[PDB]
Coordinates of C-alpha atoms in Angstrom, one line a residue:
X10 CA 41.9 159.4 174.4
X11 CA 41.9 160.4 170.9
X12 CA 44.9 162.0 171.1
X13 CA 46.5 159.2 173.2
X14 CA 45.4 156.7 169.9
X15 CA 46.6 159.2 167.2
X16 CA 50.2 159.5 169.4
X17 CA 50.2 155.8 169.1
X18 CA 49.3 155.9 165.6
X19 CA 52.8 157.7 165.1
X20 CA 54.5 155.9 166.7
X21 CA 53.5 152.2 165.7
X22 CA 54.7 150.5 162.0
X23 CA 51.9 150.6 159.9
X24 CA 48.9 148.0 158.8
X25 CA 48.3 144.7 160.1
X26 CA 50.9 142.6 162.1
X27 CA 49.8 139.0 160.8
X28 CA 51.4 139.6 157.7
X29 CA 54.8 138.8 159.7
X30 CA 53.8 136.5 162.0
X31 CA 53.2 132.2 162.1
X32 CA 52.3 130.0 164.7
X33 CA 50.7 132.7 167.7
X34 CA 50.8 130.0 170.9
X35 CA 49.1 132.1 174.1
X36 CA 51.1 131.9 176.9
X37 CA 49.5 134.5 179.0
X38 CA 46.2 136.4 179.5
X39 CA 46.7 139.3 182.0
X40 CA 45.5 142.8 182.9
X41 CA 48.6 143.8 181.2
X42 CA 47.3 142.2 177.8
X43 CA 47.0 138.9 175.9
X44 CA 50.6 137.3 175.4
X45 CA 51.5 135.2 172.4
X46 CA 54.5 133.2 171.6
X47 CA 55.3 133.8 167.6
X48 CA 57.6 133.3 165.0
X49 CA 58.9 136.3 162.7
X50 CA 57.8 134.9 158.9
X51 CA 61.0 137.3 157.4
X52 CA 63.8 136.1 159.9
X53 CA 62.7 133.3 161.6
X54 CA 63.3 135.1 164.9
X55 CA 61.3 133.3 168.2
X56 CA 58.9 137.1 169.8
X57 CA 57.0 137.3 171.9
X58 CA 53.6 139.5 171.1
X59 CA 51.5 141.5 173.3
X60 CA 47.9 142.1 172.5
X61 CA 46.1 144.9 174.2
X62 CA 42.3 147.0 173.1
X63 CA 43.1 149.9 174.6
X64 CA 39.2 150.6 175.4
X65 CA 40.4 148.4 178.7
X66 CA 44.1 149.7 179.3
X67 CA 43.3 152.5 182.1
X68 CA 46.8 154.1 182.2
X69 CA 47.9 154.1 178.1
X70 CA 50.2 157.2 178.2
X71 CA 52.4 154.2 180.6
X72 CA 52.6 152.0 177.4
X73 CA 53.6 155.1 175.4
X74 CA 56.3 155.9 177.4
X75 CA 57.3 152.2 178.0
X76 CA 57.4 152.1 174.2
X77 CA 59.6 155.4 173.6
X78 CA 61.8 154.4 176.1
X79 CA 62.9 151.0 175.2
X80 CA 63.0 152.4 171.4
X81 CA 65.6 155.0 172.5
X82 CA 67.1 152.5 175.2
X83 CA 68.1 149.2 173.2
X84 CA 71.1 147.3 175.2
X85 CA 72.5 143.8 175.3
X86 CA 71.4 143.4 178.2
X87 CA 68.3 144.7 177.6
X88 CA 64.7 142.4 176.4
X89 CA 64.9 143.9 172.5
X90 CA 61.4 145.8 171.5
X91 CA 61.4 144.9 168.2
X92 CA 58.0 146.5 166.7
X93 CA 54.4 147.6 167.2
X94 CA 51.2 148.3 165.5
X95 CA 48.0 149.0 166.1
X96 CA 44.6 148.1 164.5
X97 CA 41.9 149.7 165.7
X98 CA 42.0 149.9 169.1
X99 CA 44.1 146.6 169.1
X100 CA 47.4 147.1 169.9
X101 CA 50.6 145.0 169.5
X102 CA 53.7 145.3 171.1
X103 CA 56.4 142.9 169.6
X104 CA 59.8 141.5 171.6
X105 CA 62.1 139.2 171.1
X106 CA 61.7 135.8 173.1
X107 CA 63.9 134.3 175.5
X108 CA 63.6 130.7 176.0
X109 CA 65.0 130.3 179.4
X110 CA 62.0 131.7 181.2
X111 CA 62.7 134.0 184.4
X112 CA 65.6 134.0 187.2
X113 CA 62.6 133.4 189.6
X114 CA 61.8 130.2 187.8
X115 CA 65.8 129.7 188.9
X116 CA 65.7 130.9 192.1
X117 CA 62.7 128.9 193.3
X118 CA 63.6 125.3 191.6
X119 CA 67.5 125.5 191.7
X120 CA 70.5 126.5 193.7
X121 CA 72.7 129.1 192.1
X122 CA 76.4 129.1 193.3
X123 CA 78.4 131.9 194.0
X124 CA 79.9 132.1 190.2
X125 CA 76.7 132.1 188.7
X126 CA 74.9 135.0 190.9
X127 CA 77.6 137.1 190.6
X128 CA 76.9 136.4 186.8
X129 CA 73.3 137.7 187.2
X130 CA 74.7 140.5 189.3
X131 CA 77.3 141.4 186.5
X132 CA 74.9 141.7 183.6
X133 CA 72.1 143.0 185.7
X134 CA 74.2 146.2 186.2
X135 CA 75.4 146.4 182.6
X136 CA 71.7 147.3 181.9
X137 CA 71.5 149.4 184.8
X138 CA 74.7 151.6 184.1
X139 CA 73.1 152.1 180.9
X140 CA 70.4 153.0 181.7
X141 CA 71.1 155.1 184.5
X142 CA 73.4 156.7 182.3
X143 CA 70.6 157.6 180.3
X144 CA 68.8 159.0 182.9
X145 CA 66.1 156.4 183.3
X146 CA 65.1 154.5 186.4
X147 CA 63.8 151.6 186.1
X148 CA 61.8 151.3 189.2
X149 CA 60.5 147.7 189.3
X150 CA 63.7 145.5 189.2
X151 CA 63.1 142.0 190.2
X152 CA 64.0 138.4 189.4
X153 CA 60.3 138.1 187.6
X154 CA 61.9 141.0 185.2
X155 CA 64.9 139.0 184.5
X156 CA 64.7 137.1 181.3
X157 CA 66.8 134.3 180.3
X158 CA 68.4 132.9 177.2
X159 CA 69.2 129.1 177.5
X160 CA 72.2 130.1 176.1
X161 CA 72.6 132.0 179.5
X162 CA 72.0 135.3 178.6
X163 CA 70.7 137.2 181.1
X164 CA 68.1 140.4 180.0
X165 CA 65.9 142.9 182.0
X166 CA 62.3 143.8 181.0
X167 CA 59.0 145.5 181.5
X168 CA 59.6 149.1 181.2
X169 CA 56.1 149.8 182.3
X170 CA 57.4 151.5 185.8
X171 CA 60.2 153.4 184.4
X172 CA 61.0 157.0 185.1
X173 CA 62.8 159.3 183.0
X174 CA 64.7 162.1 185.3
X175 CA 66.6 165.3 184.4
X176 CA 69.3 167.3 186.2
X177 CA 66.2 169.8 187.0
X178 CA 64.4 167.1 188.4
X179 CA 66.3 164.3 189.4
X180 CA 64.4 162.4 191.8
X181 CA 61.0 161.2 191.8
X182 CA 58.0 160.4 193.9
X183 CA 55.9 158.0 192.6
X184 CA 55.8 154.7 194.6
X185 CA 55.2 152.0 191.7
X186 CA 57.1 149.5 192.5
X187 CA 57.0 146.2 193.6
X188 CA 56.7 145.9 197.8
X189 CA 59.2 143.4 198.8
X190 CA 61.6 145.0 196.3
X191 CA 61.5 148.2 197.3
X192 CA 64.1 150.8 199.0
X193 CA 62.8 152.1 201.9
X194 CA 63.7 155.9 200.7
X195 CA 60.5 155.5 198.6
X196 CA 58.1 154.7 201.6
X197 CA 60.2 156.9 203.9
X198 CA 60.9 160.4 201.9
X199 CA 59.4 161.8 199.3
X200 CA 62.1 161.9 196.8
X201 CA 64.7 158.8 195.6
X202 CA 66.7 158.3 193.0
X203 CA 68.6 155.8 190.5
X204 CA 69.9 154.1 193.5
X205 CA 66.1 152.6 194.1
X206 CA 67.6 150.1 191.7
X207 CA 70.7 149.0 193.1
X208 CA 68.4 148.1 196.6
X209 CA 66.2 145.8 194.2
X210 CA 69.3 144.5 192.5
X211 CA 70.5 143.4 196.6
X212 CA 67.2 141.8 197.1
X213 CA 67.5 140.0 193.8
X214 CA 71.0 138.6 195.4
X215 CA 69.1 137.7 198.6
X216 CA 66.4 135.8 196.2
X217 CA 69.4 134.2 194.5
X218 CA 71.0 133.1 197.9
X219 CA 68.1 132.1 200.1
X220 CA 64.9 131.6 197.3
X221 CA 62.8 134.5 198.2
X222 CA 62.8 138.4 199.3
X223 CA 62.7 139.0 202.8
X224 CA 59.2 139.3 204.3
X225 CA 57.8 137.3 201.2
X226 CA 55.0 135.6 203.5
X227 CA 54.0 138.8 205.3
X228 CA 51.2 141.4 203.9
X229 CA 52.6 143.8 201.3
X230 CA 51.7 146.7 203.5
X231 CA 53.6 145.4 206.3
X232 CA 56.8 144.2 204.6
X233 CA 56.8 147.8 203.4
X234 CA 56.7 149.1 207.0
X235 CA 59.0 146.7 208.1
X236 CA 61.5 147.5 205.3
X237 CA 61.4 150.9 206.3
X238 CA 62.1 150.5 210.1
X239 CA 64.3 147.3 210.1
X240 CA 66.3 148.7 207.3
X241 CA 69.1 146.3 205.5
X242 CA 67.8 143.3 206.1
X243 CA 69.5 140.1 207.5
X244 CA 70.6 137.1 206.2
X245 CA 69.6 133.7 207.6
X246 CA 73.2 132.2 207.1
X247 CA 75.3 134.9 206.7
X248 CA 78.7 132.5 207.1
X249 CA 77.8 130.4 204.5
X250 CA 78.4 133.2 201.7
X251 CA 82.4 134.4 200.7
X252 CA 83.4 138.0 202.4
X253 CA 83.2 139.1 199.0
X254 CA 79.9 138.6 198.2
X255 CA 78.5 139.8 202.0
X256 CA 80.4 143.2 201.1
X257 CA 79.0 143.6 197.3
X258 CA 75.2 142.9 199.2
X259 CA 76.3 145.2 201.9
X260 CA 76.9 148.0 199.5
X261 CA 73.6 147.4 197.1
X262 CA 71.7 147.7 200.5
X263 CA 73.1 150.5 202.5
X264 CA 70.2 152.2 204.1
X265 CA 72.7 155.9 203.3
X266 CA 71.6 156.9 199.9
X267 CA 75.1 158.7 199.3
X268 CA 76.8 155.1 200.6
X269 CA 74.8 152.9 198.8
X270 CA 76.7 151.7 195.5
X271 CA 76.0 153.3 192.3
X272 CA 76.1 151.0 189.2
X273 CA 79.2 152.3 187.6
X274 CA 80.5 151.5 191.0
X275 CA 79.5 148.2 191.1
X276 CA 80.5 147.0 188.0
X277 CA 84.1 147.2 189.3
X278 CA 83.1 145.2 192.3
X279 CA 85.4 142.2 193.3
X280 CA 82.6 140.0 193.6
X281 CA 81.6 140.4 190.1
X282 CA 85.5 139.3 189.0
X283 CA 84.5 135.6 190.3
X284 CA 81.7 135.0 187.8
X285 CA 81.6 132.0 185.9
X286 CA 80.8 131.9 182.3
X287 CA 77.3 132.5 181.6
X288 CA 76.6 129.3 180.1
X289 CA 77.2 127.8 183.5
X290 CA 73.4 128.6 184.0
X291 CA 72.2 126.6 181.2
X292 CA 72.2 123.6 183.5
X293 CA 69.9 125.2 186.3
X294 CA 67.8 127.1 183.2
X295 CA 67.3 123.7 181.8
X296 CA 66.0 122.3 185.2
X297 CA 63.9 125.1 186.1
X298 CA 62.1 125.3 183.0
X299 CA 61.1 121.2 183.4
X300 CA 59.9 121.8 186.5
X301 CA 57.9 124.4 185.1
X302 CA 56.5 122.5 182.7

């Protein structure tokens, strides 16, 4: 633990944090930390700030490794880590803001048309070619991990599930991530790959299309059983979406690993050639958030 806090210590800017920032709201109070909304006093820039005492984080070499990743990982379509630092045994992980909340707060209060999923889809897999590219998996992918700019931008976060791989060791093992997202490689073998991604980018598409996963209302231990023995699951108005987009969602879901869309493949996708500017989404990010609050 020691060394865990003095690995921290090199890694984090140094002193105290409040120097740089006004005006801390809390809008959140998890496991995970204490989460402040806060304006940078230099730039002016909207963060958000994490506050964690690591005495009650159980797993902290996960929030160095979410840290050094996202430091050596810094994309467009990526939430920005801007900074950390860590007093005591308080730590702070600063990122930027995003106004627009989360594409579940869009999936679950507005209807998306076919333009502005294949949007979402689009800049989802700019992140994930990247970061595939980069060898990193990010194992967790789901609309709650999509953050939104009102401006439309569309950005993935929470690194705290990711997996660095290695041409040595190029699949993993671990099963971290969420149930109702999950490919059912990782339930039924032992190793998966980058492609675990891709599966929770399809049931992203299904959340877009129908408001939830499939098997939202069942126990997480059996939606992962019946993932894994149903396989690609089925639509509930499967003529109601364009050929196009049934074929991208039949390719992010293959059940064949070796079948199953990769992102570079994807991004040249046909379906992805219909997307509407991303400021098309301001309407529906503007709704969502009011009924939010």
């Amino acid at each position: 633990d020691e060394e865990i806090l003095e690995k921290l210590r090199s890694i984090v800017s140094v002193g105290d944090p409040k120097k740089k920032y006004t005006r801390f709201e809390k809008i959140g109070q998890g496991a995970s930390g204490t989460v402040y909304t806060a304006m940078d006093v230099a730039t002016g820039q909207e963060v958000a700030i994490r506050q964690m005492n690591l005495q009650q984080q159980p797993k902290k070499e996960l929030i160095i490794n979410e840290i050094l990743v996202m430091r050596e990982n810094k994309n467009p379509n990526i939430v920005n880590y801007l900074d950390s630092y860590l007093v005591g045994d308080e730590l702070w992980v600063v990122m930027e803001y995003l106004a627009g909340g989360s594409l579940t707060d869009v999936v679950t209060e507005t209807c998306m048309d076919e333009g502005q999923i294949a949007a979402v889809c689009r800049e989802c897999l700019q992140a994930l070619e990247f970061l595939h590219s980069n060898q990193v998996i990010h194992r967790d992918i789901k609309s709650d991990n999509i953050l939104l700019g009102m401006d439309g931008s569309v950005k993935l976060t929470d690194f705290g599930f990711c997996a660095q791989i290695t041409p040595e060791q190029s699949k993993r093992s671990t099963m971290v991530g969420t149930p109702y997202w999950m490919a059912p490689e990782v339930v039924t073998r032992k190793a998966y790959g980058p492609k675990v991604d891709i599966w929770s980018l399809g049931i992203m598409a299904i959340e877009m299309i129908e408001g939830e996963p499939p098997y939202l209302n069942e126990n997480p231990l059996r939606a992962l059983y019946l993932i894994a023995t149903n396989g690609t699951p089925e639509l509930q108005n499967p003529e109601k979406l364009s050929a196009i987009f049934r074929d991208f969602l039949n390719r992010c879901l293959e059940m064949d690993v070796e079948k199953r869309g990769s992102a570079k493949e994807l991004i040249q996708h046909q379906f992805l050639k219909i997307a509407k500017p991303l400021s098309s989404l301001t309407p529906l990010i503007a709704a969502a958030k009011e009924a939010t609050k």
